[PDB]
Design a protein around this nucleic acid. Structure first.
Ligand SMILES: [Mg+2]
Ligand SMILES: [Mg+2]
Ligand SMILES: [Mg+2]
Ligand SMILES: [Mg+2]
Ligand SMILES: [Zn+2]
Lengths: 58, 41, 128, 138, 96, 180, 48, 157, 98, 154
RNA sequence: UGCAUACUUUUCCUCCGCCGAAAGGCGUAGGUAAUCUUUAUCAAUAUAUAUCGUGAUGGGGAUAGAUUAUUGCAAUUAUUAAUCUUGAACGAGGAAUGCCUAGUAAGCAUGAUUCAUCAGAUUGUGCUGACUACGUCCCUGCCCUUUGUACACA
RNA sequence: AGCGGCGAGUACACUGUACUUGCUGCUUCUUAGAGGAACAUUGUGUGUCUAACACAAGGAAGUUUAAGGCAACAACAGGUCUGUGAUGUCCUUA
């Protein structure tokens, strides 16, 4: 429920069989490789809830 | 259903909600008070 | 009088006069308005606050409007088939007239009448 | 003395004749008091507000509008005003002031000086619109 | 009345009728209509008060009925009453 | 002086999200007096970020076929809503709107498994949700659209699950949680 | 003989006497298929 | 008195008619012309009024009528075209042709541009339907002329 | 003088020639004014039959009307007009004081 | 209601510098006060144009119409009956078939024009085309506009 | 009512002036067209102010009944149009499936084509101006390399 | 086609504005011919630092600027002889 700010460093690869999702690297200030559903660029800040649990790279 | 009547912080909707009335009647009431969307205090 | 009776079978409840009037089978909207004008009664008032005298007057007006100022071309049922006058027919009377017309058509064995009897269109429409 | 530029949104060319005068500002034969709808009125007045009402007491303005609908017309008028005032300044008033005005306009938004290049794309057969085709049932 | 109508002029009749018919009358009536009328008249003349006269087979369905043609039968066959008047001919061709 | 609706100045407004600030620009050049901009907000990927929030709201309102391409009406409605906000439940309407926006985005969504949501997308969703809810409230009620919309906005600001958008968001969040 | 002056069967294609599908704009009076073939010679160029 | 638009269309129509008339008349001629023994023709026109592709096509048709081995004729035509300085050619002959069913036969020599306004410009095309034994043989000849320069080339000196 | 024609470049050339002729002497010639090109558009449906996704084709016969004025005597204007010319450009001279 | 802080002065001289609807209303009121124009016979039960399928519902609509016509006349040089009709056109819903534009019932307009000419406000010009304003009438209109402006200012 | 003879505007766009509730009519005027219809405005959504007030309701205009016209040699199986009245289904649509990424979707009209008359069609044109991507191969369809084939009418 | 130029007025402002009749330098708008302008130009990334892409500035415009038109080779036993006096055979011909 408590949202934690993660500034996006680099946008890795556009995942999902249908293409809606992106893989993203985000610094709080630790490297957490996460998924995003919608337009995201470098420098934009995510709304992470369940912080310490990552995604699979491409 | 809600058959509102005619014979017996200001906006028409509010009036309708409160005394159970047609909004023409609400409008009339507003006019009286004063004496196409509305706002009154 | 929340609930009223101007003619053979109406309701005419809480609605604003003209629309209440339109409940009758001279349900013209425009016609109703004209009638109101003829009467000289405020159309912003509701059906329940009307006097009985007023109602009577309205009824009278509705019956044979031709002799009143209200014009000729206007009138519901133009020449009345029965070779004579032009008059607004009103209420169940209208229905009766329609029925009579239908019967006449049937008797004639005109195509339209036949169609009506069948329960098909009349208009010229398709419905394929 | 007197300077003639245009605006342009869709089709809707508002030609702004900006002259020396007392500061009235008009459309064909009518004051900008009217325009038409009360909501959009601000889109015409905005450049004036940006530049200041005292700066236009030296400048009369007439605007001839032709073509387009309502909103487009308004936009065109705005554009004309923007081009117009600035053009006047460039010629008959100083350069620094003109530059300042331009900067102000830029800070507010585009569309005042530079034009909206969009225009109605040709309808294509097999449909009603540009892209919108009809319908297949198989 | 019917008899009265029959008695009075063509103009009057036209005025009485509904507008399409009136318009048609104004326009004219063509060469065939006259012939048809004549035929009808002949039939009437030939008639017996007990049973109706011989029919008159007709190709065309356009004719408006006028007090001339009351009492006889025409065209399959259709008898023409005074109740019909300005309601066209027809009554010919369709099934079910 | 720079202003909106010649009434609510948005020099007084505040934000306190960072991410949302980055996403929605109510700025120096995204100043506006009446929502109707003929901006080129969809010729680029992130040019919708420059778009003022009021404009976005208006666009959202504009939806539903028989009411589609009636920008002016939408604008009027939003103005009315703002006025209502100002009057009853007394606060700077812009601030309220901002608060609602902040509230509105589902932070995590489901997919074919749970994933996070970009700020812009969240904002868009919020905008949509608020308008849709308002529309629903309006439809075959009586109330009026502007009033309903205002109410919805207030609810969003509060962060209270009496309105529809908030409820939807909550549901989405729950789903996400369930997923992961 | 019956009125052949105003109707589809009144006039025809100049080219092949067909009563169907006549381009009747500008008094061309060519049935459209024929026009499509002779659009070059008449001076009708497709641009857009 | 007749309007400008109306006039133009009429003129076009007249031109077309003239062309058709010429085609009808001159089966024995290398026809292209359209600019105004011949006396009769003149009279006819008065009554009415008050290297090249078409020629080649006509020739082909004539040959067909006469009764040759077809392929040979086509080859000859191609050769002639080449001699006359054509950068490219193409002939098609589709129809019945020996067998009953089908049978379209291409005959290209030099390169033949098909797409663009260059095609419209720099090719002369012609279409004749030679009536024969049990139907029609369908000529289409297409000649690419000497260019006034093609858009594809970039000639550095 | 009104020059009606179908072919643009040719028309332009003709106009140029007439201008040149004028510039010799004695002619207060107003410049060539090209008029609104009233384009005859025919939208025919391709395909004789009703088969194939009904493609239309917008033909355009775009007539160029051109206009030019002078203060002169008839013979001189006739002479000027004689640039030889051909069947393509349709000429009309108006010799009115008004 | 209308008034606001603007960045210019308004030369309140002619009717083109006045807000329309309000002006029209004022003119109607003036007319009523005068009793200068009648309300013929058929006025009280006619429909203003094919598309309306319903009576006006304004009581003194005729006066309003007249006022509008005056304004129109002022705006344009020479204006007919047809033009007037076109101006007061609306969408006619043909029930199921889609809407068409609907030309107004011209008779009433014509009558109004006639009345105006009788009173000495409009003028059938033998040069040019159909009925423009007469100079006196124009002047009167201008005066009225000025008055309205003054009232608004007050 | 018919023919013959003489003579001249009208056959299409309609200004305008009168009659007509309306449709339309009659009289005349310009236009063989950047001139006139008409275009510094031919439209509707727009917007502003009133009447309604959630009630199959004044939403909705089907179906019907009876006239007044216009077109046409001819209008019934109603050409279309107008006037009065008739007040049906429908409370946002199941299985399925179509179209679409910026002046686009959608809404709103309108010119032209057919046309003696008649758009709910098509085809152009504009006016009001969204949402959402800015990608992916998950489906669907094409294309490619590999692979397998007893198919080649594949 | 306009814009002014200017006479002539009709209304009202200050010490010009709105509107019509009569007469005749400018080309911004109105028309339409010939030219110009964007080439990923300059800036910075990603890329075998290849072909090229992404971002930023400039700019009227940065998805060949947007939209079409044109349409190879080979077919389909696709449609059309009810478009044709393009056209075969068979039928029909008082
Ligand atoms: Mg090529
Ligand atoms: Mg069709
Ligand atoms: Mg599909
Ligand atoms: Mg095999
Ligand atoms: Zn043909």
């Amino acid at each position: 429920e408590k949202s934690k700010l993660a500034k996006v460093e680099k946008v890795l690869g556009r995942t999902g069989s249908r293409g809606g999702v992106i893989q993203v690297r985000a610094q709080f200030g630790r490297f957490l490789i996460r998924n995003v559903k919608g337009p995201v660029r470098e420098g934009d800040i995510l709304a992470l809830l369940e912080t310490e649990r990552e995604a699979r790279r491409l | 259903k809600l058959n509102h009547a005619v014979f017996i912080v200001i906006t028409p909707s509010a009036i309708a909600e409160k005394y159970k009335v047609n909004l023409s009647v609400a409008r009339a009431v507003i006019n009286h008070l004063a004496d196409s969307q509305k706002l009154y205090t | 009088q929340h609930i009223l009776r101007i003619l053979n079978t109406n309701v005419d409840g809480k609605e604003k006069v003209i629309i209440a009037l339109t409940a009758i089978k001279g349900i013209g909207k425009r016609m109703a308005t004209v009638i109101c004008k003829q009467a000289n009664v405020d159309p912003t008032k509701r059906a329940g606050e009307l006097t009985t005298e007023e109602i009577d007057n309205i009824v009278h007006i509705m019956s044979t409007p031709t002799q009143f100022k209200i014009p000729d071309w206007f009138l519901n049922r133009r020449k009345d088939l029965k070779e004579g006058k032009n008059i607004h027919v009103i209420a169940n009377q209208l229905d009766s007239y329609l029925r009579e017309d239908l019967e006449r058509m049937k008797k004639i064995r005109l195509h339209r009448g036949l169609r009506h009897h069948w329960g098909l269109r009349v208009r010229g429409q398709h419905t394929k | 003395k007197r300077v003639q530029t245009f605006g342009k949104k869709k089709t809707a060319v508002a030609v702004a004749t900006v002259t020396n005068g007392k500061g009235l500002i008009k459309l064909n034969g009518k004051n900008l008091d009217l325009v038409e709808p009360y909501i959009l009125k601000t889109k015409v007045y905005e450049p004036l507000w940006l530049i200041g009402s005292g700066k236009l007491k030296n400048l009369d303005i007439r605007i001839r509008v032709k073509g387009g609908g309502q909103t487009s017309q308004i936009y065109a008028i705005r554009q004309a005003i923007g081009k117009g005032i600035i053009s006047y300044y460039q010629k008959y008033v100083d350069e620094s002031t003109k530059k300042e005005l331009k900067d102000v306009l830029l800070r507010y938004d585009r569309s005042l000086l530079v034009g909206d290049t969009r225009r109605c794309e040709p309808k294509k057969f097999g449909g009603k619109g540009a892209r919108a085709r009809y319908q297949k049932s198989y | 009345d019917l008899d009265k109508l029959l008695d009075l002029s063509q103009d009057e009749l036209i005025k009485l009728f509904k507008a399409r018919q009136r318009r048609k009358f104004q326009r004219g009536i063509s060469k065939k209509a006259k012939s048809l009328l004549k035929k009808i008249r002949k039939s009437k003349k030939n008639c017996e008060p007990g049973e109706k006269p011989n029919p008159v087979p007709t190709h065309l369905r356009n004719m408006t009925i006028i007090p001339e043609m009351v009492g006889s039968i025409v065209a399959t066959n259709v008898e023409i009453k005074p109740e019909m008047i300005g309601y066209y001919l027809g009554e010919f061709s369709i099934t079910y | 002086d720079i202003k909106l609706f010649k009434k609510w100045s948005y020099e007084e407004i505040n934000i306190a999200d960072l991410s949302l600030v980055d996403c929605i620009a109510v700025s120096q050049k995204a100043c506006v007096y009446t929502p109707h901009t003929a901006g080129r907000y969809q010729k680029k990927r992130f040019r919708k970020a420059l778009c003022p929030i009021v404009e976005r709201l208006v666009n959202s309102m504009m939806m539903h076929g028989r009411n589609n391409g009636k920008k002016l009406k939408a604008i009027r409605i939003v103005a009315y809503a703002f006025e209502i906000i100002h009057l009853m439940t007394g606060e700077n309407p812009l601030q309220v709107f901002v608060n609602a926006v902040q509230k509105g985005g589902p932070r995590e969504d489901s997919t074919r498994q749970a994933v996070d949501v970009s700020p812009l997308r969240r904002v868009n969703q919020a905008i949509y949700l608020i308008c849709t809810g308002a529309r629903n409230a309006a439809f075959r009620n009586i109330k009026s659209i502007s009033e309903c919309l205002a109410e919805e906005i207030i609810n969003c600001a509060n962060e209270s699950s009496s309105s529809y958008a908030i409820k939807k968001k909550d549901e989405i969040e729950r789903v996400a949680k369930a997923n992961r | 003989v019956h009125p052949k002056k105003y109707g589809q069967g009144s006039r025809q294609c100049r080219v092949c006497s067909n009563k169907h599908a006549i381009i009747r704009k500008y008094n061309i009076n060519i049935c459209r298929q024929c026009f499509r073939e002779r659009a070059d010679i008449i001076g009708f160029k497709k641009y857009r | 008195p007749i309007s400008k638009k109306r006039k133009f269309i009429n003129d076009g129509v007249f031109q077309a008619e003239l062309n058709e008339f010429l085609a009808r008349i001159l089966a024995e001629d290398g026809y292209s012309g359209v600019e105004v023994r011949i006396r009769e023709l003149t009279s006819l026109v008065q009554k009415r009024f008050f290297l090249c592709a078409m020629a080649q096509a006509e020739s082909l048709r004539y040959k067909l009528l006469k009764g040759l081995a077809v392929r040979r004729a086509c080859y000859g035509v191609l050769r002639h075209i080449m001699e006359s300085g054509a950068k490219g050619c193409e002939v098609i002959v589709s129809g019945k042709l020996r067998a009953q069913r089908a049978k379209s036969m291409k005959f290209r020599d030099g390169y033949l541009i098909s797409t663009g306004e260059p095609s419209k410009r720099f090719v002369n095309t012609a279409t004749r339907s030679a009536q024969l034994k049990q139907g029609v043989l369908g000529i289409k000849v297409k000649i690419m002329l000497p260019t006034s320069i093609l858009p594809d080339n970039i000639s550095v000196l | 003088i009104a020059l009606t024609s179908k072919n643009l470049r040719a028309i332009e050339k003709v106009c140029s020639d007439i201008m040149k002729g004028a510039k010799e002497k004695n002619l207060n010639v107003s410049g060539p004014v090209r008029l609104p090109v009233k384009t005859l558009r025919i939208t025919t449906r391709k395909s004789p039959c009703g088969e194939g996704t009904n493609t239309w084709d917008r033909f355009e016969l775009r007539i160029y009307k051109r206009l030019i004025d002078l203060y002169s005597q008839c013979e001189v204007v006739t002479q000027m007009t004689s640039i030889n010319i051909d069947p393509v450009v349709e000429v009309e001279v108006i010799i009115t004081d008004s | 209601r209308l008034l606001e802080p603007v960045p210019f002065v308004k030369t309140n001289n002619c009717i083109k510098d006045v807000d329309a609807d309000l002006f029209i209303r004022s003119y109607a009121t003036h007319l009523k006060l005068h009793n200068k124009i009648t309300y013929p016979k058929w006025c009280t039960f006619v429909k203003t144009g094919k598309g309306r399928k319903l009576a006006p519902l304004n009581e003194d609509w005729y006066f309003i119409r007249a006022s509008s016509i005056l304004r129109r006349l002022y705006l344009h040089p020479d204006i007919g009956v047809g033009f007037l009709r076109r101006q007061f056109s609306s969408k006619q819903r043909r029930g199921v078939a889609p809407n068409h534009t609907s030309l107004a019932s011209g008779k009433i307009l014509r009558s109004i024009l006639q009345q105006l000419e009788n009173l000495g406000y409009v003028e059938q010009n033998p040069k040019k085309k159909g009925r423009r304003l007469t100079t006196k009438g124009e002047n009167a209109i201008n005066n009225f506009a000025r008055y309205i402006n003054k009232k608004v200012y007050n």
